Amino acid sequence: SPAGLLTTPVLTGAGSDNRWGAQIVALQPVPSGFSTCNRHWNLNGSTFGWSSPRFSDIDHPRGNASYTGTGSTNVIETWYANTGTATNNPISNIAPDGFPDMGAIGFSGQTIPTGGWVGFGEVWNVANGSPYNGTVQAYELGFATGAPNSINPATTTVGTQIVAKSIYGVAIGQNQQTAGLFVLSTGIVSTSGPNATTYTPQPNSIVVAPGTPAAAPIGRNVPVMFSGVIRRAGDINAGAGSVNGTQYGVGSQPISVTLQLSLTNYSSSLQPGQFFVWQLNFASGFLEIGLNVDGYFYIGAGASSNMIELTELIDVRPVGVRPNTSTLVFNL
Amino acid sequence: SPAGLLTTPVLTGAGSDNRWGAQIVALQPVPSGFSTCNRHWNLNGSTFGWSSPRFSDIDHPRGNASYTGTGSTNVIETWYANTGTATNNPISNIAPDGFPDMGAIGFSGQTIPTGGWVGFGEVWNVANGSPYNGTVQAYELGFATGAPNSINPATTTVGTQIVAKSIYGVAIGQNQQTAGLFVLSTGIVSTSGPNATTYTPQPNSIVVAPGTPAAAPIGRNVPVMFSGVIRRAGDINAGAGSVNGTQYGVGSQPISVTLQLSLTNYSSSLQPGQFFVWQLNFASGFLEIGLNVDGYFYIGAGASSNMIELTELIDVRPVGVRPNTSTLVFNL
Numbered sequence: 232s233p234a235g236l237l238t239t240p241v242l243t244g245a246g247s248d249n250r251w252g253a254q255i256v257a258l259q260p261v262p263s264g265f266s267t268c269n270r271h272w273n274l275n276g277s278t279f280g281w282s283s284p285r286f287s288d289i290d291h292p293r294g295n296a297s298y299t300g301t302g303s304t305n306v307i308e309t310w311y312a313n314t315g316t317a318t319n320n321p322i323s324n325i326a327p328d329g330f331p332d333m334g335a336i337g338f339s340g341q342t343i344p345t346g347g348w349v350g351f352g353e354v355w356n357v358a359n360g361s362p363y364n365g366t367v368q369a370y371e372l373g374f375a376t377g378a379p380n381s382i383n384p385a386t387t388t389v390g391t392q393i394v395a396k397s398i399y400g401v402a403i404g405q406n407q408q409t410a411g412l413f414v415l416s417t418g419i420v421s422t423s424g425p426n427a428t429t430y431t432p433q434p435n436s437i438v439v440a441p442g443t444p445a446a447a448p449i450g451r452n453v454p455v456m457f458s459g460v461i462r463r464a465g466d467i468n469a470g471a472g473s474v475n476g477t478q479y480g481v482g483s484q485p486i487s488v489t490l491q492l493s494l495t496n497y498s499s500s501l502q503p504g505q506f507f508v509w510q511l512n513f514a515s516g517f518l519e520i521g522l523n524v525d526g527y528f529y530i531g532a533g534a535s536s537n538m539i540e541l542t543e544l545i546d547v548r549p550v551g552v553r554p555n556t557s558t559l560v561f562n563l
Numbered sequence: 564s565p566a567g568l569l570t571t572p573v574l575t576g577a578g579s580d581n582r583w584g585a586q587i588v589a590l591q592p593v594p595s596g597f598s599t600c601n602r603h604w605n606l607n608g609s610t611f612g613w614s615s616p617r618f619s620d621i622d623h624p625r626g627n628a629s630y631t632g633t634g635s636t637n638v639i640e641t642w643y644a645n646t647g648t649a650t651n652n653p654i655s656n657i658a659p660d661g662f663p664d665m666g667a668i669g670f671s672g673q674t675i676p677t678g679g680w681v682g683f684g685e686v687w688n689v690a691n692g693s694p695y696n697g698t699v700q701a702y703e704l705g706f707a708t709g710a711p712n713s714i715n716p717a718t719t720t721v722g723t724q725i726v727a728k729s730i731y732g733v734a735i736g737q738n739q740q741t742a743g744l745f746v747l748s749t750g751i752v753s754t755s756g757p758n759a760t761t762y763t764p765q766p767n768s769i770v771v772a773p774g775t776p777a778a779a780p781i782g783r784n785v786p787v788m789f790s791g792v793i794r795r796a797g798d799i800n801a802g803a804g805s806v807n808g809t810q811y812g813v814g815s816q817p818i819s820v821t822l823q824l825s826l827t828n829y830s831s832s833l834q835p836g837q838f839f840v841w842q843l844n845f846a847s848g849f850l851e852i853g854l855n856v857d858g859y860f861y862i863g864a865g866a867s868s869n870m871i872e873l874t875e876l877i878d879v880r881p882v883g884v885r886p887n888t889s890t891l892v893f894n895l
């Protein structure tokens with residue numbers, strides 16, 4: 232039975248999203264719909280992504296590393312490779328396990344891009360595994376075309392590149408026709424200055440692989456993401472309730488759900504056209520949330536994209552299987 | 564009932580340890596005993612440490628930052644503060660949530676220490692939260708005395724310092740009366756060259772707070788840690804089965820156990836002098852594992868310190884409450 236996929240602790244503070252690993256504190260309705268495949272599982276035990284249902288560090292053994300200009304100190308370092316070259320990843324060769332499903336936003340000069348996935352890492356020597364220790368930095372990672380020096384974000388894994396580009400200067404740049412990449416899988420969002428940006432990634436920034444089904448709205452039932460507070464590069468100390476604004480990151484599933492779906496096949500429990508529904512009971516009201524066979528969650532928010540805070544959530548109660556065309560109750 | 568605290572997926576690939584967050588693939592017996600408090604919960608809903616049962620980041624808002632060298636570029640950066648000053652941490656002011664419970668080993672000149680906890684991060688500007696973006700590096704973090712100029716590791720939180728020192732040079736050093744620290748909570752171990760070191764941390768390197776109970780041997784029943792493969796700085800690409808040797812990190816609990824123990828109290832199901840016992844069934848043989856009220860796990864390995872691989876583990880089955888003086892069966 233799918234009832235055990237969503238329980239009270241997942242949404243009252245013990246849950247974490249499947250993209251950022253952040254503590255789930257809100258639901259984010261998406262009236263346009265969206266797609267996600269990386270670290271996302273369906274109810275047929277399957278993913279279209281390239282990541283396991285845990286937070287693996289990111290390691291690719293064969294890319295091109297460079298910096299611009301003749302000076303080698305305090306320089307922007309860029310690493311890139313084609314998609315489909317993560318030949319050591321057993322899930323998919325699209326990209327390394329853990330590599331973020333977001334477009335790599337271009338930047339040059341002194342500018343820092345807004346809204347990219349940033350991780351801390353370094354380039355390493357393919358002869359022996361040793362780091363090029365002057366290349367440690369915060370790197371924006373994502374999918375792109377035009378690397379190395381005309382980067383534009385991409386939304387597809389087909390015929391594109393994976394890129395890491397340092398958002399700040401490294402101590403000692405490396406020009407290596409072949410070099411490895413190592414980045415931790417805990418991300419922050421790129422920002423400049425003190426302001427928070429929109430919830431990240433926005434729908435049109437998510438990269439998906441061929442075959443990924445979309446989460447489309449069905450009437451007033453719209454797909455939802457799970458939101459937590461994430462760090463941002465421009466005000467690294469900002470957290471929940473910062474006077475400079477609170478930054479949210481979203482994922483398509485709680486990671487505990489992803490993990491359960493990767494270990495058990497639910498195809499006999501739910502079939503296309505149905506949701507499994509739970510009731511979320513708050514201090515003053517309730518709403519229903521539905522899960523479809525593609526692993527996406529839905530709520531009946533209609534055209535609203537206002538975040539639903541979970542602070543006053545009391546409990547989650549299973550309701551059962553219902554048609555996906557029946558409007559999910561929204562009584563907040 | 565504690566039975567649900569250990570299930571088959573925790574030990575067959577879906578579990579992670581509570582210090583490194585690494586996939587659990589082995590058990591490490593500790594015949595001489597050990598103590599752990601950080602990110603360790605007991606069966607009375609309580610921790611003696613300073614971290615939540617999750618991994619995000621380490622943030623301290625008030626330390627001293629400095630560097631050494633004839634210039635300010637490609638220099639070693641040190642940050643320190645006293646224990647007991649993390650007053651924004653609701654669990655404990657001992658240290659920031661996520662700060663590693665390991666001693667900081669001193670180093671100078673070219674060489675770096677073997678066996679320290681290393682994380683990626685930076686120091687930041689307390690006036691506005693912005694990073695000192697030239698201070699990004701891999702930093703050894705731990706507890707110490709003698710910071711900044713004569714760092715030596717400590718194993719107590721009483722009267723000591725928390726320190727971060729970059730293992731490689733930063734792009735632009737900072738000498739600041741006050742600076743913040745930001746480091747990601749998933750660490751690697753410090754090494755030089757290709758070799759792995761001993762499992763990390765060894766018992767004599769673990770930092771505990773006053774009141775932390777020890778895990779002592781009881782007859783042939785000895786405490787055990789949970790081991791997974793971790794990265795090491797000297798060969799950052801090495802993983803499981805590297806030709807250069809495999810590096811293990813240990814934690815006192817699977818993080819799923821820590822999380823469950825933090826959400827519900829088990830004091831009525833187990834009392835001092837008792838274990839809750841499970842049987843681990845392998846393709847050839849079995850062993851029993853026990854959990855005590857202080858949250859430590861035990862096996863009947865007697866004097867043996869050999870790691871036990873979980874490759875051939877088939878399943879975990881609960882046995883029930885037993886006296887801790889009864890020898891746990893070990894049939895491998």
Ligand SMILES: CC(=O)N[C@H]1[C@@H](O[C@H]2[C@@H](O)[C@@H](CO)O[C@H](O)[C@@H]2O[C@@H]2O[C@@H](C)[C@@H](O)[C@@H](O)[C@@H]2O)O[C@H](CO)[C@H](O)[C@@H]1O
Nearest residue numbers: 424425426427466469471472473474475476477690691692
């Ligand atoms: C107009 C408004 O929104 N007032 C709120 C708000 O005020 C904050 C906010 O504007 C942030 C933006 O970065 O900057 C300050 O923190 C500001 O605080 C208010 O103004 C300053 C100049 C001081 O007078 C301060 O005491 C005052 O609170 O947020 C605050 C709470 O954080 C209040 O809710 C205001 O009504």
Ligand SMILES: CC(=O)N[C@H]1[C@@H](O[C@H]2[C@@H](O)[C@@H](CO)O[C@H](O)[C@@H]2O[C@@H]2O[C@@H](C)[C@@H](O)[C@@H](O)[C@@H]2O)O[C@H](CO)[C@H](O)[C@@H]1O
Nearest residue numbers: 358359360756757758759798801803804805806807808809
């Ligand atoms: C003496 C011994 O135990 N040899 C093993 C070992 O050999 C490896 C190992 O020594 C690593 C250490 O970093 O370096 C090489 O990979 C070495 O490989 C062996 O020797 C080289 C010179 C080549 O001849 C190579 O083909 C050969 O395998 O590990 C390997 C498995 O990786 C074997 O198990 C050896 O018997």
